[PDB]
Design a protein around this ligand. Sequence first.
Ligand SMILES: Cc1cc2nc3c(=O)[nH]c(=O)nc-3n(C[C@H](O)[C@H](O)[C@H](O)COP(=O)(O)O)c2cc1C
Ligand code: SF4
Ligand code: FES
Ligand SMILES: [Cl-]
Ligand code: NA
Lengths: 157, 417
Amino acid sequence: TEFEFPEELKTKLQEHINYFPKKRQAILLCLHEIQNYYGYIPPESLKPLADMLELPLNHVEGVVAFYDMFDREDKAKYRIRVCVSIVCHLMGTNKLLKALENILGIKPGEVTPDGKFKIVPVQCLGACSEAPVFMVNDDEYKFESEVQLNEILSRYT
Amino acid sequence: SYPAIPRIYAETTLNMLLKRAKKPRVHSIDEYLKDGGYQALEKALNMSPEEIIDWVDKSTLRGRGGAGFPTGKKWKFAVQNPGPRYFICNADEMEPGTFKDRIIIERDPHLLIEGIIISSYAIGANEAYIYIRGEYPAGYYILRDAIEEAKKKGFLGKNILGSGFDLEIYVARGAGAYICGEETALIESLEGKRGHPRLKPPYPVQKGLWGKPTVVNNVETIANVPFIISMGWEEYRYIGPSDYAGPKLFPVSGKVKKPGVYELPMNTTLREVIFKYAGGTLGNKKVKAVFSGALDCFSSEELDIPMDYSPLGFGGTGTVIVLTEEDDIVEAALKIAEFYEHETCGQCTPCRVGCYEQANLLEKIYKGEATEQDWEGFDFVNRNIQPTSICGLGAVAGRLIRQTLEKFPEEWEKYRK
Ligand SMILES: Cc1cc2nc3c(=O)[nH]c(=O)nc-3n(C[C@H](O)[C@H](O)[C@H](O)COP(=O)(O)O)c2cc1C
Ligand code: SF4
Ligand code: FES
Ligand SMILES: [Cl-]
Ligand code: NA
């Protein structure tokens, strides 16, 4: 049957849509919410959302494709966004990636066998003074050492 | 309860934008009000919109977002056009080294909201927007909750403090396009479309959000507004040099002992920023070069320049990335090339191919896989990104890298071999 949103999701989506003066302005908050729920943007989920937004599907797809943050390719509970830009690279992005490889056994762009962690190479995260920087979903941290990183990641279950 | 944020070091000599934000925690409305907050708003709502515009103009407040456009004048241009109008606070950061705006948003959200309300009232906007990057979730939730705080204290909503002025502030989110920081693209995203900039003119202050006069202003710009109203434009123009007056946030990063955001006046030298305030270099290694975000490159011989918007001044957003004698200038330029590779939106052909190929060939140069044609090609591509570009990204993608070829040729020659 027609794919449909769980009500604990559809409630939030409906809230986002009513937040702005025009429904269409909600598209990015809906996608953030959809990816937060599913661990990725299910292709199946865009048709219902287009209806919800009173926008064409091809518009919605075109938007998903354009924005780096949205992934319709790979599922992951937790996205380790690793900053690879100028400052983080100078201050030891590599030692962070090395530690991530050692602990999780995956390189940038890859997902752990349990689909728990995906490492995502991103541009500057806006905490250059706390370099090298990474996020674990919404949580943002300075990398200090492998032992320090191992402890943080233990907090994600 | 908000997500984890690293506690960037903050230090001020003026005790204005960072008076609260120097302490690395959320300051909620009762604290803001206790430092006399929203009193500038009360004062402003008892002046006419036109007189606020005058004060902001006489202040000499300039855009903090990298344009250095005189803020008072931007507002004048907005209000020449018929209402209704919209005020947008550019919460998008993206540019590397730049983390000044996040410490206002995350620590003193109310300074920003007060700024947005006064500025909105000045241009007669009854609807305002904060477009905050998606990599700032804490800032998103902190702004949403802090706006709710302002609503309940009756600073937002309809007929605010019996003034007759209506304002809602809406918080939209990015999803990882840098170009969404360029003011026309930001509006395209707010309208629920791809972050593709518009051909100018029309300019936003004439045709912007749904073709209505639109003021887009940087987080740091809007943060200055309450001070101008509260202190008076005379007392504000007294801070630092009269021609580029007021407090400035300098995000300092790289090989310095005390990296963080510094609130200084703009007659501070780039040497003062690094060595007096930022506590000098790591290992006291000689400074090699300073990168002004992804915009410019200054050598160790240009440290004596003011941090103001003047021609021979530092300018930009006041972003200071410090490299020492032991840092590869080429490897650095590669990482600036790779930034512009990712963040060209691909509308304009020289920019789309130029930004990508610059990075592709420089990567080959850096790895010692470059043919002599890839070298000649890298050089040509770099000087041919600007042509046809309808926004500043194409104009600047090759700028920094060119300066490094000019100022450090010996280090680039190491890579020719
Ligand atoms: C490609 C590009 C990206 C930009 N990104 C940002 C940004 O992240 N933040 C910002 O405040 N201004 C950014 N700007 C500058 C804006 O075009 C504009 O100058 C600014 O939003 C106006 O604020 P101001 O008057 O306070 O300077 C960018 C400009 C361009 C061309
Ligand atoms: S110059 Fe580059 S980033 Fe700017 S609109 Fe053209 S293609 Fe997009
Ligand atoms: S360079 Fe990594 S956060 Fe900016
Ligand atoms: Cl104040
Ligand atoms: Na964005």
